[PDB]
Amino acid sequence: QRMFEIDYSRDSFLKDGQPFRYISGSIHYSRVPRFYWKDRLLKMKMAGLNAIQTYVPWNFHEPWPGQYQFSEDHDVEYFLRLAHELGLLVILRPGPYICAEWEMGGLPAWLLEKESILLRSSDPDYLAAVDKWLGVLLPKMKPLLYQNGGPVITVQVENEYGSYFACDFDYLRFLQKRFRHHLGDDVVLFTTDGAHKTFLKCGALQGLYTTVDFGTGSNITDAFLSQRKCEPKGPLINSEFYTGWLDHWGQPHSTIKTEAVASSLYDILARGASVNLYMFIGGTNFAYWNGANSPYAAQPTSYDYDAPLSEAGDLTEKYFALRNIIQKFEKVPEGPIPPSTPKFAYGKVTLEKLKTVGAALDILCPSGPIKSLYPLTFIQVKQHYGFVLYRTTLPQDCSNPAPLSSPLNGVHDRAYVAVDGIPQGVLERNNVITLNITGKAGATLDLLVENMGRVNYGAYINDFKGLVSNLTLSSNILTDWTIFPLDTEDAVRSHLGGWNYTLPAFYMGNFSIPSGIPDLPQDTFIQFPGWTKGQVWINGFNLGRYWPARGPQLTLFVPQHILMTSAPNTITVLELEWAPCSSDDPELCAVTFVDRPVIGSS
């Protein structure tokens, strides 16, 4: 019955034998709570989009080999059926690498158990893992294909492979074969690359439809000319037309002017091109899901992106401007649009110190530490995200400051250093590779090391994390390590089993919200004035990382569905550098909930 094809004669798609052009927006289901999926998708439909595009992050669904997450917030099949329900078609981008400002570009960290693995290549072990994953993911996607009665009209193979150094065409051919095996011969498969011959050279493949991406700064004629060199016939397609841009901690918040996005969008549509707006809603990197760029710079918790729908799904002036552009080409749905959610300022909530990390090792590491002559990486100790404690003893007296150093810049990515429970400061990847320390001979030297997010783009995506090379004290290699993987997520859920720098520590407090009030709880934004850098949970849900010391993001988005009215709400903060809690004023040791986000602080 149902057909979706490239017709090479009208330089067009044909949907059920009819000319069809898609106007799509990116929404990542892994970046929006399922609680809000229908809200965001309906707002997208009301803007006049006839499709949405999404990434399937492999690491979000296969945390360990043969252990799968496809329920609740991880229910990609439900997300796709919901789009279909709403009358939206779907452009699926299952990777296996997705880039996406996401931890290791979507690639599971357990791949790095083979230390020499060449990711995104014909490396047999990488291929074998990909094949197993595709064997689980793609039969799920097959019934969701358009010709089988679902919304999925096209499927991207890999992601900007032309930008990667390997240029392994056999790898692309493998993916083509395997996608065809599972999905059949009719599904439109495609690739996306930068709009230049240099990018297309290694990214394009025979039998995969070549598309390009570009934002508001690109010459649109030249960009499509570059696509046309690869595909003389067929639809013009811009698969990632940038509505904004990504951020890094410590760098000014990225914005793109509404007038520029509207002007380029109109230009692209008027050409008869299919287009996807990246991002339409950006949402949030909750927990440890953010990625990084090289030279090492992590992206923040917010993935607001300056997108047409704000992080919390708000209707922006950019949203209405783009909807007005779409309306010049297509009739958009009638009726009022679902509103921006109400936001509530719950106000100040005092916290109290629970325990330092150092005092909580029984709860954080209930299996006991691993001993090693030299330091081991996160992967070697079977921990992918969060924090690992490295412990040794001082081999000499350090009454005078002694250089603690990682000569090969092997602190990936940041270490909070203490000696006999006295904080010494911080080692930082690419920035501070030496720190002067003091303490007695035999004193306990602790390094709490944070994985700040695995690099998601470029050659250095094989990003192990931890102490990846030796530390020296006064030029001498430090040996005899006691390494504690830290079960932070379990420990926070159990209130740590109790069911200038400060020592890394957990602080906790409670706030209640009244029941029987129709419009509470509401969404809110948590702010950390006086704090420095850490992690935050509300009711055990890891909301991500805060860093008001660096910016530009000051507030974190808190979705209302994790807040309750039946029992008090708990807030737990892991502060890594300096807590405003040593003062004799308990009111200082506190967080604040505000009703407007601050993501563009200077």
Next chain:
Amino acid sequence: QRMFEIDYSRDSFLKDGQPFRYISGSIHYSRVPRFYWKDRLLKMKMAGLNAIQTYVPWNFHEPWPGQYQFSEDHDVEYFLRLAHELGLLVILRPGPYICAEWEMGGLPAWLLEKESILLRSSDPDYLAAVDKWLGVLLPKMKPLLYQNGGPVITVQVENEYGSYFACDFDYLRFLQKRFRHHLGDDVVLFTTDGAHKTFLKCGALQGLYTTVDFGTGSNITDAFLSQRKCEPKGPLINSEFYTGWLDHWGQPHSTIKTEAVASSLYDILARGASVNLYMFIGGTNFAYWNGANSPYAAQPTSYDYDAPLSEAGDLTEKYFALRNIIQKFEKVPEGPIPPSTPKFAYGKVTLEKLKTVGAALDILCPSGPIKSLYPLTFIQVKQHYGFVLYRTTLPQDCSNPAPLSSPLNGVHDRAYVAVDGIPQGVLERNNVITLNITGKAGATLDLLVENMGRVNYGAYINDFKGLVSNLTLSSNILTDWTIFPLDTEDAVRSHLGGWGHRNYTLPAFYMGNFSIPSGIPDLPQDTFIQFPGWTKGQVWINGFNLGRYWPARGPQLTLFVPQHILMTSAPNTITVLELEWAPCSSDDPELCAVTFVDRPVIGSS
């Protein structure tokens, strides 16, 4: 064990042996959907109030003798428990007359089945009905008394009886005896009257603690001196400190400046007086619950009152100002205040004419009409609220216009007139008692008569409604009437029978639907419905009577729509009964429409 008493020695209340004074606000549960009771009550607590005050409208709970309504939106017992659960005390004002800009001051219209009844007196038939009501209501209130473990700390007897002409002290003694019988000998019983000896003369009674009321334009010293003449000892009390004032259709919206309310409130509290703010939230007169004053002027649907909480429960600058003054005397609760609800503009919804009233008679009046030589009142035909159709035949040719009159001014309160399906205009209490009509001899003369609300204050609360006296045509009395009481609420809920039973236009029902998406956390939201191009009528959404609209008079243009009556996926049905002129004749379907907006307009020019 718990105690609440007047300490006469020390001019105070005692609560469990401790000095106490109350800072209360009025909330009428009959004017707030139950969906929102906890919301309003919590905002009230967060303002620093330690008590709320409320009226029990008798007619709201006993629509016919022995038929009672105490469930859902009528659940007084629950409202009082909810207040108690929030840590609020209650000043209960059970009447039996409450005034309150409410239909007939709370008294049931069926009292008027005795035409000569003297309301609010020792009239035996009045007392018998009062006694039966008290014997149902008061035993429900007994466990809610403070000394039995509930919130109720004081109870008002009657309501400003000193303003009424009768001065029947037997009546007051009878209430006192009956309240004591049911509630016991400890409950503080009190009266409230205007702060002047001319009011207190007939309102105050031995054994009932005399309190006064006054607003921002009163001298506080003089007002409390007037109280002290009646109660030399005991707490100073202002039982109705006015934060705003009532409205009437066609008059500008009443406001009172925030600074005036704040300053007077400060001065009252500084005297150590207990005080209740009337109203703290006013809410809404849904359906036909509004009252009227004399000379006849009905209060509108909105009871916003310019109160510190707006009709939809919003936090206003007045709210925060009053909270700030209360904080100067007492500690106010910690924590953020529940917010003003979100409002959503659902936009324009087109309607279309379903049926005229005349075409829907069989569904509105399924038991048939009552025939009578001369017209009968609402009360006589056993209808209390809404609309009754009076029908006769023209006895003379009226090819030339002939005067239809109510010589004794007895159209109570408005009649929409038609002859053989052609609208002739409107007869109006006081204003227009004659209308020229045309039609052939034997033509059907219809008058659709609306009860615009029974007067709630003054001598004239015995307000029957309907054609209360004869009609004349060219000076000759019109005889032989066929009178149709109209079950509009039943008929609207069944879509004029379409869902089964499991310049002027003819009065008619206009319907339209709109949908709200499901699975959206923040929809449905509260909204406000506006009627541009419409004239006068009644409005329902999903069978819930939201009240009366009258953009032709104002000041209320919009009507408050609470979100809980709206539904997702399934279409919401709006029914408009337009009485005078609908914007629905022209070939432009777009004009026959209502509009939902996100801001109220109750104070338009």
